[PDB]
Amino acid sequence: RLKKPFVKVEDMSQLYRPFYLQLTNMPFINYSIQKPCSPFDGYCECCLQKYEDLETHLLSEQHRNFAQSNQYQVVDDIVSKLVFDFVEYE
Amino acid sequence: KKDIEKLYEAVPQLSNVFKIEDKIGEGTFSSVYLATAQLQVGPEEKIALKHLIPTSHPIRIAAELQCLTVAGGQDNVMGVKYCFRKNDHVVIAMPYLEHESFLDILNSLSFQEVREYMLNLFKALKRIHQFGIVHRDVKPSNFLYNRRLKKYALVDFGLAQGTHDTKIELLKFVQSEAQQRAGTPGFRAPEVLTKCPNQTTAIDMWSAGVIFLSLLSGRYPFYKASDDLTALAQIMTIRGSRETIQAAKTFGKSILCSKEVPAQDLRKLCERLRWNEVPDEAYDLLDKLLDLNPASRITAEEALLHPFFKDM
Ligand SMILES: Nc1ncnc2c1ncn2[C@@H]1O[C@H](COP(=O)(O)OP(=O)(O)O)[C@@H](O)[C@H]1O
Ligand SMILES: [Mg+2]
Numbered sequence: 001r002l003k004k005p006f007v008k009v010e011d012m013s014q015l016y017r018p019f020y021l022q023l024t025n026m027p028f029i030n031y032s033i034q035k036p037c038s039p040f041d042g043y044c045e046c047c048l049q050k051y052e053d054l055e056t057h058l059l060s061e062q063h064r065n066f067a068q069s070n071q072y073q074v075v076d077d078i079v080s081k082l083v084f085d086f087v088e089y090e
Numbered sequence: 091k092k093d094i095e096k097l098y099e100a101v102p103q104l105s106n107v108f109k110i111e112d113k114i115g116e117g118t119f120s121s122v123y124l125a126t127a128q129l130q131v132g133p134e135e136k137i138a139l140k141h142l143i144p145t146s147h148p149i150r151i152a153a154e155l156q157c158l159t160v161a162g163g164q165d166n167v168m169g170v171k172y173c174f175r176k177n178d179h180v181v182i183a184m185p186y187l188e189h190e191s192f193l194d195i196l197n198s199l200s201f202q203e204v205r206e207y208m209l210n211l212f213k214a215l216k217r218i219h220q221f222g223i224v225h226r227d228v229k230p231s232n233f234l235y236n237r238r239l240k241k242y243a244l245v246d247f248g249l250a251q252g253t254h255d256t257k258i259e260l261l262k263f264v265q266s267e268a269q270q271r272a273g274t275p276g277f278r279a280p281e282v283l284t285k286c287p288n289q290t291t292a293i294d295m296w297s298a299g300v301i302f303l304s305l306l307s308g309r310y311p312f313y314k315a316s317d318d319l320t321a322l323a324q325i326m327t328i329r330g331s332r333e334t335i336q337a338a339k340t341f342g343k344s345i346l347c348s349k350e351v352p353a354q355d356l357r358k359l360c361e362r363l364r365w366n367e368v369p370d371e372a373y374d375l376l377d378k379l380l381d382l383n384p385a386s387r388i389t390a391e392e393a394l395l396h397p398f399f400k401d402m
C-alpha cells in the first residue's frame with residue numbers, strides 16, 4: 001500500500017489513530033557537510049477558542065471578561081509569597 | 091521598540107521599577123526583555139522580564155511561577171525575584187544571567203568545559219526531578235551558560251508537567267500533552283515522539299543526551315526536524331531502527347519502518363563528525379542518556395555518579 005520510504009506508528013491498544021511519515025529519502029548521516037551543520041542537513045487557552053488575530057482576540061469582549069476576573073487568583077496566591085526587593089518610584 | 095512601550099502599557103507598574111532596555115527573547119508563549127532596576131539593598135541589578143502571552147491559562151502561568159518559586163534559585167535552576175500582573179498580562183522577573191549562544195561556543199569548548207557543562211545540567215535536572223517536575227523542553231536555549239563566569243541556569247517551565255507524585259501542586263492541574271504545548275522535535279525522546287501516554291522525568295534525560303551528542307559531535311542542531319516523526323526517523327538512523335522498534339514495543343507503541351538502518355557506534359559517529367583523548371566513559375554515558383528504553387535510561391542522580399564525572 002504505502003509508498004516508500006515510510007515510517008508508521010501505532011498504539012498497541014487502539015488509544016491513538018495511526019500516524020505516518022513519508023519523505024523523498026530517509027535521513028542520511030552526512031559527514032561531508034561542515035560543522036556545525038546538522039549531519040541531517042493561534043489558540044486561546046483562556047476562552048477555549050481558536051483565534052485568527054492575537055491582538056484582535058485580546059481586544060474581544062469574551063477575552064476581556066476572562067482577563068478582568070478572579071481567574072488569576074491562583075497566580076496572585078504565589079505572588080503574595082514573594083518578597084518585593086526593588087525600589088519603586090512614584 | 092514599540093514592544094517596550096506596549097509592555098509598559100499592559101503592565102503600568104513596570105514603569106515605576108524597571109528601565110527596560112532590550113528584547114532578548116521571543117517564543118510562541120513569551121517575550122523576554124532585559125531591564126535594569128535598583129535594589130533596596132543598594133546596587134542596581136540586571137533583570138529578565140518574561141512576558142507571558144495573554145492567551146495562557148492562569149493555571150499554566152501559575153505552574154511555571156510555582157516551579158520557579160519552589161524548585162528554582164538553587165542548583166542551576168533559575169529562580170524568581172518577583173512577578174507583576176495587570177489582568178491577563180503577567181511578567182515574571184528573574185535575575186538576568188548573561189549567556190553564550192550555544193552555536194558560537196560549540197566548536198570552542200575545551201573537553202573539560204564539556205564535562206562541567208553536562209555536570210551542571212545534571213545538577214539542575216536532579217533538582218527539578220526531586221520535585222517531580224518534568225521540564226519537557228530541555229535544550230540549549232533553555233539552559234543558560236555563562237562561560238566566563240562558570241554560571242548555569244535551567245529556565246523556561248512553560249511546558250513543564252508533573253510526575254504522578256509531583257511536589258508542585260499546580261502541575262496536577264496541567265493538561266498532559268499526550269492527553270490534550272509541544273517542544274522542539276529534535277530534543278524529544280522516542281516515547282514523546284510516539285505519543286506515549288506515560289512520560290516521566292526520563293524524557294528530560296534523553297534531551298540532555300541530545301545536548302551531549304551536539305557537544306561531542308560539534309553539530310548543532312544535531313537532529314534538524316520540523317516534526318516529530320522526522321526526528322524519530324533521524325533517531326533511528328543514529329540508534330538503529332531495529333533497536334528503536336524493540337524498545338517502543340516495551341512502551342505500548344508499534345513502529346513499522348520501511349528501510350532498516352543499523353545502530354551507529356557513538357565514538358566513531360562523533361569523531362567523524364567533529365579532545366585528542368575523549369574517554370570511553372563519555373560515550374558510555376551518552377549511550378545511557380540515549381537509551382531508547384525510558385525505564386532503563388539513566389537518571390540525573392545516577393548520571394552525577396557516572397565515571398565520566400570523576401573527580402569533580
Ligand atoms: N533569567 C534570564 N537571564 C537571561 N536571559 C534569559 C533569562 N530568561 C530567559 N532569557 C532569554 O530569553 C529566552 C526565552 O526565554 P524562555 O524562558 O526560554 O521563554 P520562551 O522560550 O517561551 O521564549 C531564553 O532562551 C533566554 O535567551
Ligand atoms: Mg525557552
Ligand SMILES: [Zn+2]
Binds near residue numbers: 045046057066145
Ligand atoms: Zn481569550
